[PDB]
């Protein structure tokens, strides 16, 4: 069938962008059946993304999300209590199901002025490996971990599906801007940023900055909570639940 049709398919595998997707086509790899016969032609990320292809296309019930949240938040608390981990995405907005678990991590000792500290994220990552929560890795980054995890099923018990997990390590002074952005709703973040500009401020993934009289973004403003951000723009605080595609 159509080449783009073949391509559009391959992209659905985690780790297979359009570039890598076209190279698989030329080499004759159009289908999943083909991909599973050609793992050597994929990098690890992709090799594993294909391994769990079926499990990653399913939705995640909120009950499972919760169980997952607990495992994560516990180990992280027991490791170092100064840690701060907030599961975000649709889950934070009270969606009955998620597509994947998006964790954001931070620590007082790690600011944007301080030294890069991958071991703050890896310490959390390797522990989740011990307790057998993270089954596989897709990409062990310095600031973001991408990988696979599974809820425990003690035996004779039909195993849970495997789920996509993201863990972003973020500077403390940029944390609640990250949570805002990664909880958001595409439309809510768009609407809030627009009102930011109305009130003369500029919000982004990292920071909220005032806009000078000539329109030059100023210094990042102190943010110790999502409320702070709302306050700067003097906008009523919307609970995550009300960050729908219905605006008021």
């Amino acid at each position: 069938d159509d080449t783009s049709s073949s391509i559009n398919f391959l992209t659905r595998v985690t780790g297979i962008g359009p570039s890598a997707a076209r190279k698989l086509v030329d080499e004759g790899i159009k289908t999943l059946e083909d991909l599973r016969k050609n793992e050597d032609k994929l990098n690890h990320h992709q090799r594993i993304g294909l391994k769990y292809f079926e499990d990653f296309e399913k939705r995640i019930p909120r009950e499972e999300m919760l169980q997952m949240q607990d495992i994560v938040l516990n180990e992280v608390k027991k490791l170092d209590p100064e840690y701060i981990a907030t599961v975000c995405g649709s889950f934070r907005r009270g969606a009955e199901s998620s597509g994947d678990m998006d964790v954001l991590l931070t620590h007082p000792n790690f600011t944007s002025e301080s030294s890069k500290q991958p071991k703050l994220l890896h310490r959390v990552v390797e522990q989740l490996q011990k307790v057998r929560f993270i089954t596989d890795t897709l990409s062990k980054g310095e600031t973001k971990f991408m990988g696979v995890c599974q809820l425990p099923s003690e035996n004779d018990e039909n195993e849970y599906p495997h789920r996509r997990i993201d863990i972003r390590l973020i500077p403390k002074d940029q944390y609640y801007c990250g949570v805002l952005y990664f909880t958001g709703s595409d439309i809510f973040n768009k609407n809030m940023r627009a009102h930011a500009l109305e009130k003369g401020f500029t919000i982004n993934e990292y920071t909220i900055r005032p806009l000078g009289v000539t329109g030059v973004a100023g210094e990042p403003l102190p943010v110790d909570s999502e409320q702070d951000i709302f306050d700067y723009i003097q906008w009523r605080y919307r609970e995550p639940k009300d960050r729908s595609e219905h605006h008021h």
């Binding site: 009130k199 900055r209 005032p210 806009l211 000078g212 009289v213 000539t214 030059v216 973004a217 100023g218 210094e219 403003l221 102190p222 702070d228 306050d231 700067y232 003097q234």
Partner: protein, 151 residues
């Protein structure tokens, strides 16, 4: 070295007794909005001579944000004839502003904290914009301001 301020070129809003000229007199003797309820106020000070700005001190009086631009007498002086030396900086949170707490914060702005592009150049005018939108009660402006040239 303290730069010496000559006089006041302009001022968008100033109180009768807390006028813009007090930004010349040493002490605190303030510059304040004619009307609180205003959201921003502005001044233009002329310098005694074209010199290079190395460092800026800002003495706050109720303002939520402060920005400092620079310019020259030559080439006229309008809105965006001015360059941003110090970008809008925070002196007072929304909560504090809403409750007139800690109006008197003071800050130093060393070379690194200036927009290097503009600070390399030298000027003889300085635009100063004070903002305070989180209250329509409290007086707001500046206690003092000190510009410095390299040693």
């Amino acid at each position: 070295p303290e730069i010496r301020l000559r006089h006041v070129v302009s001022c968008s809003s100033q109180d009768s007794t807390h006028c813009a000229e007090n930004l010349l007199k040493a002490d605190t003797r303030k510059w304040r909005a004619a009307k609180a309820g205003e959201k921003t106020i502005s001044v233009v000070l002329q310098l005694e001579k074209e010199e290079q700005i190395h460092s800026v001190d800002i003495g706050n009086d109720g303002s939520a944000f402060v920005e400092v631009l620079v310019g020259s007498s030559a080439g006229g002086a309008g809105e965006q004839d001015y360059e941003v030396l110090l970008v809008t900086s925070s002196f007072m949170s929304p909560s504090e502003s809403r409750s007139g707490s800690n109006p008197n914060r003071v800050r130093m702005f060393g070379p690194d904290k200036l927009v290097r592009a503009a600070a390399e150049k030298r000027w003889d005018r300085v635009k100063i914009v004070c903002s305070q939108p989180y209250s329509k009660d409290s007086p707001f402006g500046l206690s003092f301001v000190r510009f410095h040239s390299p040693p």
